[PDB]
Design a protein around this ligand. Structure first.
Ligand SMILES: *[C@@H](C)[C@H]1/C(=C/c2[nH]c(/C=C3N=C(/C=C4\NC(=O)C(CC)=C4C)C(C)=C\3CCC(=O)O)c(CCC(=O)O)c2C)NC(=O)[C@@H]1C
Ligand SMILES: *[C@@H](C)[C@H]1/C(=C/c2[nH]c(/C=C3N=C(/C=C4\NC(=O)C(CC)=C4C)C(C)=C\3CCC(=O)O)c(CCC(=O)O)c2C)NC(=O)[C@@H]1C
Ligand SMILES: *[C@@H](C)[C@H]1/C(=C/c2[nH]c(/C=C3N=C(/C=C4\NC(=O)C(CC)=C4C)C(C)=C\3CCC(=O)O)c(CCC(=O)O)c2C)NC(=O)[C@@H]1C
Ligand SMILES: *[C@H](C)[C@H]1/C(=C/c2[nH]c(/C=C3N=C(/C=C4\NC(=O)C(CC)=C4C)C(C)=C\3CCC(=O)O)c(CCC(=O)O)c2C)NC(=O)[C@@H]1C
Ligand SMILES: *[C@H](C)[C@H]1/C(=C/c2[nH]c(/C=C3N=C(/C=C4\NC(=O)C(CC)=C4C)C(C)=C\3CCC(=O)O)c(CCC(=O)O)c2C)NC(=O)[C@@H]1C
Ligand SMILES: *[C@H](C)[C@H]1/C(=C/c2[nH]c(/C=C3N=C(/C=C4\NC(=O)C(CC)=C4C)C(C)=C\3CCC(=O)O)c(CCC(=O)O)c2C)NC(=O)[C@@H]1C
Ligand SMILES: *[C@H](C)[C@H]1/C(=C/c2[nH]c(/C=C3N=C(/C=C4\NC(=O)C(CC)=C4C)C(C)=C\3CCC(=O)O)c(CCC(=O)O)c2C)NC(=O)[C@@H]1C
Ligand SMILES: *[C@H](C)[C@H]1/C(=C/c2[nH]c(/C=C3N=C(/C=C4\NC(=O)C(CC)=C4C)C(C)=C\3CCC(=O)O)c(CCC(=O)O)c2C)NC(=O)[C@@H]1C
Ligand SMILES: *[C@H](C)[C@H]1/C(=C/c2[nH]c(/C=C3N=C(/C=C4\NC(=O)C(CC)=C4C)C(C)=C\3CCC(=O)O)c(CCC(=O)O)c2C)NC(=O)[C@@H]1C
Lengths: 162, 172, 172, 162, 172, 162
């Protein structure tokens, strides 16, 4: 999994070298940034349900047809609504994992790999998820570097969907 | 591979759960103890050549059969390979220390090593002795009170000892 | 690989024999039934995406444990791999239909697949369910009376069903 | 084995693709041509013995020394004569297999692969076999497209010996 | 690989010993018998094609089942592979003769050959017959008194026979 | 192991060919040169102890510090002196092996491979061994081609240490 620490080790290992000061500084950076990262992760986790509920409703408001159109790919049924809330929860959970791990690893492995395929096969519109992510970014209530950390991963997900 | 943080994340994902407050606190404490971990890695790495050479010299002094003509460390090619293995094991152990997880050590070194030595005819028991000697030297160096801000690194040293013992058990 | 014709030839060569009149007639009848075979391949292939997607959606609805966090189809990478396997199996089954022989299916897909899933931890029994669902859909599509010159394709459908069942048995 | 059908499948498989109309047409061509191919195969098979006997004797007439020269590579002995008739029968059998399979596969696999080696090691003259094949081509009694199909494979063998 | 000289050296090194006078004399005698060894290699190599072809023709005459349709030497590709194996074995046997040691033969040919034939379905017993026929022909040619300075090569012929028998036993 | 014979076989084998006259001549050369080579090997072996003892003392005389400096890499202790004599004996033994085998194989495999590493790790000065080898070359008492054979391998070792 990709993190500031595994990347440092991977680099040294690929060169068959012991870790050098060059890599020990990268980890120090990760440790110092962890303060803001963890603050963001705790906040997003504490307010997970309201952010998920609000995000789903941002999507339905931006794309009204997703609440009425006939088809299992939409949330016009109770099952579809549950699938959508579940998915948004997955995205938020992944964001908190990235913050905790200090890197995109988590999201890369559990969500982004195969994302395009999945959206294509099940006829899910990437724009739906981008709207949910934009809602989370606008309403997580974070400021300072904690916001910077949260937004970096939210935008990373948005770019992966673009 | 996985580091201490990725490990907690992986466990949470398999359960489909956000982290608990008890977990967040645990990871936050790992970060707070980061400086000590970096010192240990820096100190051991900075003395890698002597740790290996001293351990090798000690091993061959105690087990002269290894260097006698016909022994597994006899001939320069064989001696070189043996010294290389010692540095490789020490290298991966330091990776584990930095990561706070043994995954990298187990995956990229330990696993399959016992079967590798058996096929070659290399005495795994002797390799274990070499590894234990590097332990003791590495810990003495990492936990040396001189030239460092005073503090307790006992927990970390126990962790470090664990990685070395794990390596010794994988070849013994 | 071998098709229905090459198969008869291979059997004759091992015996060092020219084909018999009974054989020539058999192969001639395969040719006469060629149009139906081509229609089946065209129809199934033309609906490949929905056959796979519908079967997958059905499988996950019946076995929700597969998509739950920790389940074998959980995470997009795992789901993608599962969808891929379904399309791969369907692809090779259609190759078998065109060839009129299961050799290509057995060689380039089936053989070794059971051991592959066991190593991964993928439930072969569930894969079999997915394959059976694609059967039923593929046959319904291939044997749909609408928009095609009326005729009996029962024998061909039995043959097609056989290839699907063969695939299901190789992973179950 | 190389045939119009296995070639179509091999192409699709190499590209990791389902069969397309591009390949379904190739097989249709094979099915339509099978009428003439099977006619040729049945005829050659029905008249196999006379064609084989006549072909052997065309070779002995073109190369008289093969009936008198001392050496196991010649047909100056009963054993040599039997080996020669056997070989010619092999060639004819292969031709009928190609006609049945709709391609050169059969001949490629069972006879052409290793042919040069064999002729060299056992001191067999390719020209002997070319003469036998020419006799079969001139005397199979086929006309129209059936002849075209038979001659295509007979000439394929001749080229392999050249 | 190792030749007769390297073999003695390897044994001495494992013991950490200089060679003894008894050894030096032995190696010196190998050198003195070198001309005979070179003649044997030259003669066998110079007649390699006929040795292989004659042995093959003999084998197929005695065991017609091998060339009958369905037999392991049936089809030109199979016959070619069989002739190739015979030349390969003869080639490695001559290498052993030049080296005065079977190491090259065992390593680069023999080892693993029995398992190779079993997987293919090739009758190892028949291969052994082919090898024995090439023995007899090779020795008759190498030990032919005509056109060579008179002398006793009995010891060398026994050595040569040993390499052939070693090959026959590795596949039988 | 590299020798005039294994090299001939390796060449033929890499080309999948039977040995040719091209290789049989190389071996003849080896057999003819063996006379001088064996003479050198026997002499060096017979006088091994005095050459080893004299060589060690040439090193200590050229580099006096090796007899007084504190450190396990030096021969200032009984153990160090024994290690040094042992090493010099190894070099001489290897030289006799090369003479016997007719090539550098022995020395290449048992001593040169890993040599640089070893000298670096244990802080052994290559110059020490070069001096010992120079002593052996100057005092083996050989003349003619026997000397030429002995010196070729001694110089080979010196070059490997350079
Ligand atoms: C146990 C291993 C010993 C010990 C450790 C100890 N270290 C510190 C503090 C610091 N260590 C560093 C070192 C680094 N920071 C880095 O980014 C890198 C890689 C480039 C290294 C090597 C730093 C910067 C500090 C803080 C400032 C300082 O020098 O104090 C402490 C203090 C507490 C805390 O955690 O920082 C301690 C206790 N102390 C011992 O007595 C053991 C022998
Ligand atoms: C069973 C599978 C169903 C069925 C089949 C059926 N098909 C035909 C006839 C034809 N089918 C084709 C189709 C193709 N020819 C091709 O070369 C290709 C690939 C490019 C395809 C897809 C053609 C040309 C014919 C003949 C002309 C026609 O349209 O009739 C028949 C008729 C008999 C015969 O064998 O041809 C039948 C019975 N019919 C059904 O009711 C099943 C649901
Ligand atoms: C047993 C195998 C038969 C036999 C052998 C025999 N050979 C010789 C002598 C020589 N053989 C050679 C041949 C070569 N020298 C080479 O360098 C090469 C490769 C390029 C070859 C092929 C030579 C040069 C000699 C010496 C000169 C000569 O022709 O005599 C002997 C004589 C003794 C000795 O060892 O030389 C013998 C006995 N003799 C037989 O009767 C066996 C059938
Ligand atoms: C919500 C924004 C909109 C919506 C969602 C919706 N999604 C699905 C189905 C799936 N969603 C996923 C996504 C993931 N699976 C993962 O493992 C991960 C990473 C942990 C993600 C992000 C997948 C794989 C599926 C299909 C398989 C399944 O059902 O789980 C559906 C159902 C589609 C169907 O046909 O059954 C729906 C409705 N739909 C909307 O209209 C919202 C705007
Ligand atoms: C030294 C304390 C002991 C000893 C060691 C010895 N090891 C080998 C050979 C090999 N060791 C490995 C191990 C690894 N290779 C890796 O890439 C990794 C992970 C980065 C590990 C752990 C391998 C693969 C080999 C074989 C390949 C090679 O030799 O390069 C030897 C050589 C044996 C030989 O005959 O060539 C030796 C001598 N020997 C001892 O006596 C000590 C107890
Ligand atoms: C879907 C219905 C089920 C499922 C599938 C699943 N499969 C894999 C992984 C692999 N599948 C194969 C199979 C093939 N590869 C081939 O090239 C061919 C022939 C063309 C076949 C048949 C292979 C090789 C793999 C592993 C390599 C890879 O993943 O790419 C996975 C992934 C497992 C993992 O941990 O990575 C999954 C999930 N899983 C289910 O739950 C369904 C029942
Ligand atoms: C006939 C035109 C002339 C002739 C023939 C002759 N052939 C052989 C021996 C062999 N022929 C083959 C050919 C094949 N083997 C195959 O498996 C196939 C494909 C199915 C072919 C075409 C082979 C392999 C042999 C050698 C092995 C064997 O005996 O089967 C001989 C005998 C040669 C000998 O030395 O024993 C003869 C005489 N010879 C003529 O003069 C005719 C003009
Ligand atoms: C001939 C006397 C008998 C016989 C032989 C036969 N062998 C094979 C196939 C193979 N033989 C080998 C052996 C080697 N390959 C090597 O590189 C070396 C060292 C240089 C050796 C010893 C191998 C690897 C194969 C398989 C690969 C290949 O075929 O090229 C066959 C072919 C079997 C097939 O089905 O393709 C045959 C027929 N067969 C007999 O009946 C004789 C008794
Ligand atoms: C002598 C010229 C000087 C000297 C020598 C000295 N050498 C060592 C230690 C080692 N020497 C070797 C050399 C070899 N090992 C081999 O297997 C081979 C090929 C067969 C060779 C050439 C090795 C591997 C070692 C280290 C391992 C061991 O002890 O065997 C020492 C001891 C170093 C130590 O720290 O213990 C010494 C003293 N030293 C001098 O000052 C002389 C001038």
């Amino acid at each position: 999994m990709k993190t500031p620490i595994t990347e440092a080790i991977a680099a040294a290992d690929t060169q068959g070298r012991f870790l050098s000061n060059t890599e020990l500084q990268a980890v120090d950076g990760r440790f110092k940034r962890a303060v803001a990262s963890m603050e963001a992760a705790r906040a997003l986790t504490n307010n997970a349900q309201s952010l998920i509920d609000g995000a789903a409703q941002a999507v339905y408001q931006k794309f009204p047809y997703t609440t009425t159109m006939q088809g299992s790919q939409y949330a016009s049924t109770p099952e579809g609504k549950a699938k959508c809330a579940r998915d948004i929860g997955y995205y938020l959970r992944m964001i908190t994992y990235c913050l905790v791990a200090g890197g995109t690893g988590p999201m890369d492995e559990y969500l982004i790999a195969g994302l395009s395929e999945i959206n294509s096969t099940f006829d899910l519109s990437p724009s739906w998820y981008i709207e949910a992510l934009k809602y989370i970014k606008a309403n997580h209530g974070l400021t300072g570097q904690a916001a910077v950390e949260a937004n970096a991963y939210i935008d990373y997900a948005i770019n992966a969907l673009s | 591979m996985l580091d201490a943080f990725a490990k907690v994340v992986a466990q949470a994902d398999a359960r489909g759960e956000f982290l608990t407050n008890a977990q967040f606190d645990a990871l936050s404490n790992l970060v707070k103890e980061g400086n000590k971990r970096l010192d240990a890695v820096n100190r051991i790495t900075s003395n890698a050549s002597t740790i290996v050479a001293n351990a090798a010299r000690a091993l061959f002094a105690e087990q002269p059969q290894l260097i006698q003509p016909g022994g597994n460390a006899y001939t320069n090619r064989r001696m070189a390979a043996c010294l290389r293995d010692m540095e490789i094991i020490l290298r991966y152990v330091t990776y584990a220390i930095l990561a706070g997880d043994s995954s990298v050590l187990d995956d990229r070194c330990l696993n399959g090593l016992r079967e590798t030595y058996q096929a070659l005819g290399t005495p795994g028991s002797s390799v274990a002795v070499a590894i234990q000697k590097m332990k003791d030297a590495a810990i003495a160096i990492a936990n040396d009170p001189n030239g460092i801000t005073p503090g307790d690194c006992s927990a970390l040293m126990s962790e470090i000892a664990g990685y070395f013992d794990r390596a010794a058990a994988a070849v013994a």
